[PDB]
Amino acid sequence: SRYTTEFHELEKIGSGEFGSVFKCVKRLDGCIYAIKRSKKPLAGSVDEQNALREVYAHAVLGQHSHVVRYFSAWAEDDHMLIQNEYCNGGSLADAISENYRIMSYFKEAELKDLLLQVGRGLRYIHSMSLVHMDIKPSNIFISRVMFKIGDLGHVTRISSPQVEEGDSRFLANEVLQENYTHLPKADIFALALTVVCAAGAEPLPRNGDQWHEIRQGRLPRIPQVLSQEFTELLKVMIHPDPERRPSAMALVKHSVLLS
Ligand SMILES: CNC(=O)c1nn(C)c2c1C(C)(C)Cc1cnc(Nc3ccc(N4CCN(C)CC4)cc3)nc1-2
Protein backbone atom coordinates (compact mmCIF):
# COMPACT_ATOMS: atom_id res chain seq x y z
CA SER A 1 0.00 0.00 0.00
CA ARG A 2 1.57 3.27 -1.16
CA TYR A 3 -0.53 5.12 1.40
CA THR A 4 0.58 2.86 4.28
CA THR A 5 4.13 2.76 2.97
CA GLU A 6 4.79 6.44 2.28
CA PHE A 7 2.64 7.95 5.05
CA HIS A 8 1.71 7.39 8.69
CA GLU A 9 -1.91 8.31 9.41
CA LEU A 10 -2.32 10.59 12.45
CA GLU A 11 -5.94 11.71 12.65
CA LYS A 12 -9.07 12.17 10.54
CA ILE A 13 -9.67 15.87 9.97
CA GLY A 14 -12.47 15.65 7.41
CA SER A 15 -15.39 13.44 6.38
CA GLY A 16 -18.53 13.58 4.23
CA GLU A 17 -20.08 11.95 1.18
CA PHE A 18 -16.86 13.00 -0.54
CA GLY A 19 -14.83 10.48 1.48
CA SER A 20 -12.35 11.27 4.28
CA VAL A 21 -9.35 13.54 4.82
CA PHE A 22 -6.49 12.47 7.08
CA LYS A 23 -3.67 14.30 8.78
CA CYS A 24 -0.59 12.23 7.81
CA VAL A 25 3.17 12.50 8.18
CA LYS A 26 5.19 11.62 5.08
CA ARG A 27 7.93 9.25 6.19
CA LEU A 28 10.60 10.49 3.80
CA ASP A 29 10.54 14.20 4.65
CA GLY A 30 8.86 14.27 8.06
CA CYS A 31 6.30 16.80 6.84
CA ILE A 32 2.58 16.87 7.54
CA TYR A 33 0.13 16.50 4.63
CA ALA A 34 -3.65 16.30 4.25
CA ILE A 35 -4.56 13.17 2.32
CA LYS A 36 -8.02 13.03 0.75
CA ARG A 37 -9.20 9.44 0.39
CA SER A 38 -12.27 8.63 -1.71
CA LYS A 39 -14.05 5.59 -3.12
CA LYS A 40 -13.41 5.53 -6.86
CA PRO A 41 -16.63 6.93 -8.35
CA LEU A 42 -18.89 5.02 -10.75
CA ALA A 43 -17.91 5.75 -14.35
CA GLY A 44 -20.23 8.34 -15.91
CA SER A 45 -21.33 9.74 -12.55
CA VAL A 46 -21.48 13.27 -11.14
CA ASP A 47 -18.87 12.00 -8.68
CA GLU A 48 -16.48 11.04 -11.47
CA GLN A 49 -17.23 14.40 -13.10
CA ASN A 50 -16.31 16.19 -9.86
CA ALA A 51 -13.18 14.05 -9.50
CA LEU A 52 -11.98 14.85 -13.04
CA ARG A 53 -12.30 18.62 -12.54
CA GLU A 54 -9.86 18.41 -9.63
CA VAL A 55 -7.21 16.36 -11.49
CA TYR A 56 -6.95 18.80 -14.33
CA ALA A 57 -7.19 21.93 -12.18
CA HIS A 58 -3.99 20.66 -10.60
CA ALA A 59 -2.44 19.95 -14.01
CA VAL A 60 -2.99 23.62 -14.90
CA LEU A 61 -2.54 25.40 -11.57
CA GLY A 62 0.95 25.98 -10.21
CA GLN A 63 1.75 26.70 -6.57
CA HIS A 64 0.14 29.73 -4.98
CA SER A 65 0.22 31.36 -1.55
CA HIS A 66 -3.56 31.41 -1.31
CA VAL A 67 -4.44 28.07 -2.90
CA VAL A 68 -4.10 24.78 -1.01
CA ARG A 69 -1.11 23.10 -2.64
CA TYR A 70 -1.47 19.80 -4.47
CA PHE A 71 1.51 17.41 -4.35
CA SER A 72 0.35 14.11 -5.87
CA ALA A 73 -2.57 11.80 -6.63
CA TRP A 74 -2.92 8.05 -7.10
CA ALA A 75 -5.34 5.13 -6.82
CA GLU A 76 -5.43 1.77 -5.07
CA ASP A 77 -8.02 -0.73 -3.82
CA ASP A 78 -10.64 1.13 -5.85
CA HIS A 79 -9.98 4.33 -3.87
CA MET A 80 -8.64 7.67 -5.10
CA LEU A 81 -5.99 9.32 -2.88
CA ILE A 82 -4.83 12.96 -3.15
CA GLN A 83 -1.88 14.45 -1.20
CA ASN A 84 -2.44 18.07 -0.20
CA GLU A 85 -0.87 20.79 1.90
CA TYR A 86 -2.00 20.68 5.57
CA CYS A 87 -3.48 23.88 6.98
CA ASN A 88 -3.09 23.75 10.78
CA GLY A 89 -5.82 26.32 11.37
CA GLY A 90 -8.56 24.20 9.81
CA SER A 91 -11.32 25.82 7.74
CA LEU A 92 -12.90 29.25 7.97
CA ALA A 93 -16.14 27.37 8.73
CA ASP A 94 -14.55 25.82 11.86
CA ALA A 95 -13.20 29.23 12.88
CA ILE A 96 -16.64 30.87 12.59
CA SER A 97 -18.21 28.01 14.59
CA GLU A 98 -15.58 28.55 17.31
CA ASN A 99 -16.32 32.30 17.37
CA TYR A 100 -20.04 31.58 17.59
CA ARG A 101 -19.19 29.42 20.62
CA ILE A 102 -16.30 31.07 22.51
CA MET A 103 -17.81 34.44 21.66
CA SER A 104 -14.79 36.12 20.09
CA TYR A 105 -14.96 37.68 16.59
CA PHE A 106 -13.14 38.76 13.44
CA LYS A 107 -12.47 42.48 13.78
CA GLU A 108 -13.44 44.65 10.78
CA ALA A 109 -9.75 44.62 9.90
CA GLU A 110 -9.49 40.83 9.97
CA LEU A 111 -12.43 40.77 7.54
CA LYS A 112 -10.53 43.05 5.17
CA ASP A 113 -7.51 40.74 5.44
CA LEU A 114 -9.62 37.68 4.57
CA LEU A 115 -11.19 39.37 1.56
CA LEU A 116 -7.85 40.49 0.20
CA GLN A 117 -6.11 37.15 0.71
CA VAL A 118 -8.86 35.02 -0.85
CA GLY A 119 -9.08 37.77 -3.48
CA ARG A 120 -5.45 37.13 -4.36
CA GLY A 121 -6.19 33.42 -4.72
CA LEU A 122 -9.05 34.06 -7.12
CA ARG A 123 -7.03 36.58 -9.11
CA TYR A 124 -4.52 33.80 -9.78
CA ILE A 125 -7.07 31.07 -10.61
CA HIS A 126 -8.93 33.44 -12.91
CA SER A 127 -5.66 34.34 -14.64
CA MET A 128 -5.25 30.69 -15.66
CA SER A 129 -8.70 30.96 -17.30
CA LEU A 130 -10.34 28.87 -14.57
CA VAL A 131 -13.08 29.52 -12.02
CA HIS A 132 -13.39 27.87 -8.61
CA MET A 133 -17.25 27.73 -8.47
CA ASP A 134 -17.65 26.68 -4.82
CA ILE A 135 -16.19 29.46 -2.68
CA LYS A 136 -17.59 29.26 0.84
CA PRO A 137 -16.24 29.16 4.41
CA SER A 138 -15.74 25.38 4.48
CA ASN A 139 -13.49 25.63 1.38
CA ILE A 140 -11.23 28.32 2.79
CA PHE A 141 -8.47 26.98 5.06
CA ILE A 142 -6.11 28.59 7.53
CA SER A 143 -2.38 28.20 8.15
CA ARG A 144 -0.90 29.87 11.24
CA VAL A 145 -2.12 33.91 9.31
CA MET A 146 -2.64 32.76 5.70
CA PHE A 147 -5.99 32.03 3.97
CA LYS A 148 -6.02 29.46 1.16
CA ILE A 149 -8.64 28.24 -1.28
CA GLY A 150 -9.20 24.48 -1.21
CA ASP A 151 -11.51 21.85 -2.73
CA LEU A 152 -11.17 22.22 -6.51
CA GLY A 153 -13.85 19.68 -7.46
CA HIS A 154 -16.09 22.37 -9.00
CA VAL A 155 -13.28 24.11 -10.92
CA THR A 156 -14.06 24.62 -14.61
CA ARG A 157 -12.82 26.62 -17.61
CA ILE A 158 -13.95 30.21 -18.15
CA SER A 159 -14.22 29.54 -21.89
CA SER A 160 -15.87 26.10 -22.14
CA PRO A 161 -17.40 25.75 -18.65
CA GLN A 162 -18.64 22.43 -17.35
CA VAL A 163 -20.77 23.75 -14.52
CA GLU A 164 -21.79 21.82 -11.47
CA GLU A 165 -23.28 24.43 -9.17
CA GLY A 166 -21.81 25.00 -5.78
CA ASP A 167 -23.66 25.42 -2.52
CA SER A 168 -27.00 27.16 -3.15
CA ARG A 169 -26.32 29.49 -0.25
CA PHE A 170 -23.44 31.20 -2.05
CA LEU A 171 -24.68 30.85 -5.61
CA ALA A 172 -25.15 33.81 -7.98
CA ASN A 173 -28.58 33.97 -9.64
CA GLU A 174 -27.11 34.27 -13.12
CA VAL A 175 -25.43 30.88 -12.66
CA LEU A 176 -28.83 29.41 -11.68
CA GLN A 177 -30.18 31.05 -14.83
CA GLU A 178 -27.71 29.02 -16.92
CA ASN A 179 -25.76 32.17 -17.77
CA TYR A 180 -22.10 31.19 -17.82
CA THR A 181 -20.71 34.21 -19.72
CA HIS A 182 -19.05 35.76 -16.63
CA LEU A 183 -18.28 32.89 -14.25
CA PRO A 184 -15.36 34.67 -12.47
CA LYS A 185 -17.91 37.10 -11.06
CA ALA A 186 -19.81 34.19 -9.47
CA ASP A 187 -16.64 33.53 -7.42
CA ILE A 188 -16.71 37.23 -6.37
CA PHE A 189 -20.39 37.03 -5.39
CA ALA A 190 -19.58 33.91 -3.37
CA LEU A 191 -16.57 35.47 -1.64
CA ALA A 192 -18.64 38.41 -0.48
CA LEU A 193 -21.17 36.19 1.31
CA THR A 194 -18.25 34.20 2.78
CA VAL A 195 -16.97 37.39 4.34
CA VAL A 196 -20.46 38.24 5.60
CA CYS A 197 -20.49 34.78 7.23
CA ALA A 198 -17.17 35.57 8.89
CA ALA A 199 -18.60 38.87 10.13
CA GLY A 200 -21.18 36.96 12.17
CA ALA A 201 -24.25 36.84 9.95
CA GLU A 202 -27.10 34.48 10.80
CA PRO A 203 -27.07 31.33 8.64
CA LEU A 204 -27.53 32.07 4.93
CA PRO A 205 -30.82 31.02 3.31
CA ARG A 206 -30.81 28.04 0.97
CA ASN A 207 -33.85 29.32 -0.96
CA GLY A 208 -37.19 31.09 -0.47
CA ASP A 209 -37.74 34.82 0.02
CA GLN A 210 -34.54 35.85 1.73
CA TRP A 211 -32.47 33.95 -0.86
CA HIS A 212 -34.00 36.04 -3.65
CA GLU A 213 -33.66 39.22 -1.60
CA ILE A 214 -29.91 38.73 -1.37
CA ARG A 215 -29.49 38.37 -5.14
CA GLN A 216 -31.19 41.76 -5.52
CA GLY A 217 -28.00 43.15 -3.98
CA ARG A 218 -29.27 43.11 -0.38
CA LEU A 219 -26.67 42.19 2.28
CA PRO A 220 -27.60 39.82 5.08
CA ARG A 221 -27.96 41.37 8.54
CA ILE A 222 -24.57 41.88 10.24
CA PRO A 223 -24.36 41.97 14.05
CA GLN A 224 -21.43 44.42 14.16
CA VAL A 225 -20.14 47.90 13.40
CA LEU A 226 -18.78 48.00 9.84
CA SER A 227 -17.99 51.23 8.00
CA GLN A 228 -20.39 52.26 5.24
CA GLU A 229 -17.32 52.16 2.99
CA PHE A 230 -16.51 48.46 3.47
CA THR A 231 -20.28 47.81 3.33
CA GLU A 232 -20.58 49.24 -0.18
CA LEU A 233 -17.66 47.15 -1.38
CA LEU A 234 -19.37 44.00 -0.10
CA LYS A 235 -22.63 45.30 -1.55
CA VAL A 236 -21.37 45.84 -5.10
CA MET A 237 -19.80 42.37 -4.97
CA ILE A 238 -23.34 40.93 -4.89
CA HIS A 239 -24.78 43.36 -7.48
CA PRO A 240 -27.42 41.52 -9.59
CA ASP A 241 -25.48 42.53 -12.71
CA PRO A 242 -22.29 40.45 -12.70
CA GLU A 243 -20.51 43.01 -14.92
CA ARG A 244 -20.82 45.60 -12.15
CA ARG A 245 -19.06 43.34 -9.64
CA PRO A 246 -15.29 43.84 -9.20
CA SER A 247 -12.96 41.42 -10.94
CA ALA A 248 -10.49 39.72 -8.59
CA MET A 249 -8.01 42.18 -10.15
CA ALA A 250 -9.99 45.27 -9.20
CA LEU A 251 -10.58 43.65 -5.82
CA VAL A 252 -6.99 43.05 -4.72
CA LYS A 253 -6.20 46.65 -5.76
CA HIS A 254 -9.20 48.29 -4.08
CA SER A 255 -8.44 51.26 -1.80
CA VAL A 256 -10.55 49.95 1.10
CA LEU A 257 -8.59 46.70 1.42
CA LEU A 258 -4.97 47.80 1.10
CA SER A 259 -3.78 46.93 3.64
C1 LIG B 1 -13.60 17.66 0.09
N1 LIG B 1 -12.67 17.85 1.19
C2 LIG B 1 -11.72 18.77 1.19
O1 LIG B 1 -11.46 19.46 0.24
C3 LIG B 1 -10.95 19.02 2.42
N2 LIG B 1 -11.45 18.87 3.63
N3 LIG B 1 -10.49 19.19 4.55
C4 LIG B 1 -10.91 19.07 5.96
C5 LIG B 1 -9.35 19.53 3.97
C6 LIG B 1 -9.54 19.48 2.50
C7 LIG B 1 -8.38 19.84 1.54
C8 LIG B 1 -8.52 21.18 0.83
C9 LIG B 1 -8.33 18.73 0.53
C10 LIG B 1 -7.01 19.80 2.23
C11 LIG B 1 -6.99 20.18 3.70
C12 LIG B 1 -5.83 20.68 4.28
N4 LIG B 1 -5.79 21.00 5.60
C13 LIG B 1 -6.87 20.84 6.42
N5 LIG B 1 -6.71 21.19 7.70
C14 LIG B 1 -7.48 20.98 8.83
C15 LIG B 1 -6.89 21.03 10.13
C16 LIG B 1 -7.64 20.82 11.27
C17 LIG B 1 -9.03 20.58 11.16
N6 LIG B 1 -9.80 20.37 12.32
C18 LIG B 1 -9.71 21.34 13.42
C19 LIG B 1 -11.11 21.32 14.04
N7 LIG B 1 -11.40 19.91 14.27
C20 LIG B 1 -11.22 19.31 15.60
C21 LIG B 1 -11.64 19.04 13.13
C22 LIG B 1 -10.23 18.97 12.54
C23 LIG B 1 -9.65 20.53 9.86
C24 LIG B 1 -8.87 20.74 8.71
N8 LIG B 1 -8.02 20.35 5.88
C25 LIG B 1 -8.09 20.00 4.56
Side-chain angles (χ1 to χ4, degrees), residues 11 13-14 18 21 34 36 68 84-91 94 141 150-151:
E11 109 182 34
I13 55 178
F18 73 77
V21 176
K36 188 147 69 190
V68 174
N84 309 277
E85 172 184 4
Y86 174 77
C87 296
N88 54 12
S91 81
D94 306 297
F141 295 83
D151 196 347

Side-chain angles (χ1 to χ4, degrees), residues 60-246:
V60 168
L61 295 172
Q63 319 170 13
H64 193 271
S65 230
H66 298 293
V67 184
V68 174
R69 187 151 176 211
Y70 157 93
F71 288 98
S72 61
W74 71 95
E76 58 198 348
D77 296 342
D78 196 68
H79 283 61
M80 283 171 160
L81 300 130
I82 302 184
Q83 178 194 357
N84 309 277
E85 172 184 4
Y86 174 77
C87 296
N88 54 12
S91 81
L92 174 62
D94 306 297
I96 297 168
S97 293
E98 196 74 82
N99 282 344
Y100 189 83
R101 182 222 149 271
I102 212 186
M103 197 61 270
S104 302
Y105 58 83
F106 292 120
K107 305 148 204 85
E108 197 250 26
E110 284 156 340
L111 292 180
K112 279 182 186 183
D113 181 43
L114 170 71
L115 177 59
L116 185 57
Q117 283 196 42
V118 180
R120 282 168 171 181
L122 293 180
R123 181 218 96 263
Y124 175 68
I125 293 180
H126 294 167
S127 70
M128 304 299 304
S129 300
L130 301 166
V131 287
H132 185 278
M133 298 295 286
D134 201 16
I135 297 298
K136 45 174 189 177
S138 62
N139 285 334
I140 303 288
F141 295 83
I142 304 159
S143 288
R144 330 187 320 275
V145 113
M146 293 282 297
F147 297 97
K148 303 175 178 253
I149 303 165
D151 196 347
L152 305 187
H154 291 66
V155 176
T156 197
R157 297 288 315 276
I158 297 181
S159 53
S160 305
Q162 302 297 335
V163 172
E164 267 296 4
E165 293 106 311
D167 196 311
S168 85
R169 289 175 297 177
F170 297 85
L171 185 65
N173 202 50
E174 67 269 5
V175 177
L176 211 65
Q177 289 185 329
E178 273 149 57
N179 176 12
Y180 305 141
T181 55
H182 310 285
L183 281 185
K185 307 300 192 71
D187 281 342
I188 297 287
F189 180 96
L191 175 51
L193 298 188
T194 298
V195 168
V196 177
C197 289
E202 271 167 1
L204 295 180
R206 295 181 173 274
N207 48 45
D209 279 346
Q210 292 141 45
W211 186 98
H212 280 287
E213 276 199 331
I214 292 160
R215 279 75 192 169
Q216 299 174 7
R218 235 185 197 183
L219 284 176
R221 310 298 240 176
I222 321 287
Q224 71 168 130
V225 180
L226 297 179
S227 50
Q228 316 170 22
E229 280 49 316
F230 184 51
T231 287
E232 283 294 321
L233 180 50
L234 295 174
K235 188 178 237 163
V236 72
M237 285 175 73
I238 58 172
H239 197 290
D241 181 8
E243 309 197 41
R244 292 203 93 201
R245 291 165 206 163

